[PDB]
Assembly symmetry: C3
């Protein structure tokens, strides 16, 4: 048999959402990550919509998207938050990066904290720097063609309380190695669990902690992780896997 499946029309719809109302380093990442996903849509393998205004997307308009890619922020208004809740509870897809999972005592969105796996922002290192990362599960579609360990390019890295690993429904896929400790020049992280890529198995979602600055696409290994993360979430659609059409 022939080994290749050539698409006859776009396979699925993806929505990119990012804000300009964020730290310059987060806007820079969001703009370069948009270019990265646009390049993946050269030849129209899928339908890619880009927005800076999530208020135009109630649940009824979010339904058509296989996946939402949130590059630097999460919904802030009740209307936006409710739309995303209903979308995720009804089998929607999510690829979240860095500050898209940021939450503290002033977020007042317990559904989101639960959706992420319980982790509230705890600490971070400073300045952004490369780190040694480790694959927690080598048999997963996100990591099956990734080296067991590699140096990720420079980012600001976050710890959470409790660690998402403490959640029975969370599957941690990549972690920041404790061999990096003490980590930081300005703000130093000295210990603790440091997961950076995970999935809450109750939802069709993946979170990646990297997403800061203008140099997150200089590394082939991390770019492969991003392709793998996006592809896995898209393939898991309850209405069917789009790569089999």
């Amino acid at each position: 048999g022939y080994p290749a499946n050539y698409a006859k029309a776009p396979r699925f719809k993806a929505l990119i959402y990012y804000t300009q109302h964020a730290e310059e380093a987060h806007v820079q990442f969001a703009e370069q990550a948009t270019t990265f996903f646009k390049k993946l849509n050269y030849g129209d393998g899928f339908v890619l919509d880009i927005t800076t205004d999530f208020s135009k997307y109630p649940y009824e308009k979010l339904k058509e998207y296989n996946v939402i890619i949130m590059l630097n922020t999460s919904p802030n208004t009740k209307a936006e938050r409710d739309a995303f809740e209903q979308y995720m509870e009804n089998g929607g897809g999510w690829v979240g990066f860095h500050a898209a999972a940021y939450n503290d005592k002033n977020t007042h969105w317990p559904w989101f904290v639960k959706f992420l796996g319980g982790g509230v922002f705890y600490c971070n290192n400073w300045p952004p720097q490369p780190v040694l990362v480790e694959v927690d599960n080598e048999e997963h579609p996100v990591t099956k063609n990734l080296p067991a360990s590699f140096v990720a390019p420079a980012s600001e890295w976050y710890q959470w309380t409790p660690s998402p690993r403490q959640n029975k429904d969370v599957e941690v896929l990549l972690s920041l190695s404790p061999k990096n400790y003490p980590l930081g020049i300005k703000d130093v992280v000295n210990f603790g669990d440091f997961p950076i890529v995970w999935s809450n198995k109750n939802y069709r979602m993946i979170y990646l902690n990297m997403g800061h600055g203008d140099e997150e696409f200089i590394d082939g290994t991390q770019n492969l992780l991003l392709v793998n993360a996006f592809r896995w979430v898209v393939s898991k659609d309850k209405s069917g896997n789009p790569f089999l059409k």
Copy 2:
């Protein structure tokens, strides 16, 4: 004695040939790869000539080059084809990239199909993406200082039929790992042998499947493979190894 051999004059002549009559991503690679080889000639270690018109090179003018670097296409006219045939049959050198080996039912160049090792274009993945690659032979001068496996930067990757590995006179040096399967977002490759760097031992030649887009030089490991590929073909010259002068 002293461990270094300093050149007294340029060691050999190389010719770069690429076309502007190709997909923009093929011209982008060709332009960046030309810069890469120009940087290797800082200080004039060799003589590097660059052309976009192979019709100016009959066999008598190709004789003067140790190696021809074909970045994105192969000869298309009988005169150009015949010149390249005579050059390769008389001990000439070749470094071919990506679309320089492309051939199908409308090519009508059976010598070139044989020269490449028999492989006719079969399929490809889409869009371009990084992949896990594996060294087939770790003792070879092209791969002796390369990691056993690594993630190559983004490219469009080709399968051939029959696989060049099936030819007794071909030595496969690098392979796209089956751990990458299923490979593709638009056009998905699900199985089969996937050699990407090989040599037909009947000629002083090397083929590298990568060569697409404007980010093929972001990776030190793949840049080393390219230095190694070029150096190996040049060293094997029948009139003597230029690196020993």
Copy 3:
């Protein structure tokens, strides 16, 4: 308790010194390496001063710095050499790159030759190219989160005589692998010991042989080595580790 130490004010002072009176490739590295250290000082984790004139820094003014980063040259006048000698003998810190350690029969500075570990310039490869490098000691703070081996991005590489490894007081941390031999297109290095990152344990210092051209920051792994090198020299300040404040 809490795993993170957030700085309340800049932790230490660093001085960058580079010359414009050097090969362009050495000036290009120096300018990009200055940007790299400026990015490490985003948010003012430390105080970073930059100069092209070391004659403005007698010992009395050098004492205020935890570390001196020498990107492409060493002190050339007796006044500049005496200032640097007194600074290093009184517990000063040093991070040196590439041509900053260059010395030959016309240097007439035996203190510096001793400070470096005894190595006099012997030979080099040409043109600059990536190479397979190996970690010599995996337990050291400079290498504890680095892969055991990796391909470093393109640089011109130096051999010394005698090897710094022959010195009982020197700790070699990274080496250029002999698997790279024969190394070079123009100027070929065929054998010998090839250390590239080391420390003379009699001083608070680290030397890194890389530092040539405009593409030394394309690799996450080598960027981590540079962060690690800088952090380790700074952390060993006799007046106390600045990262524990």
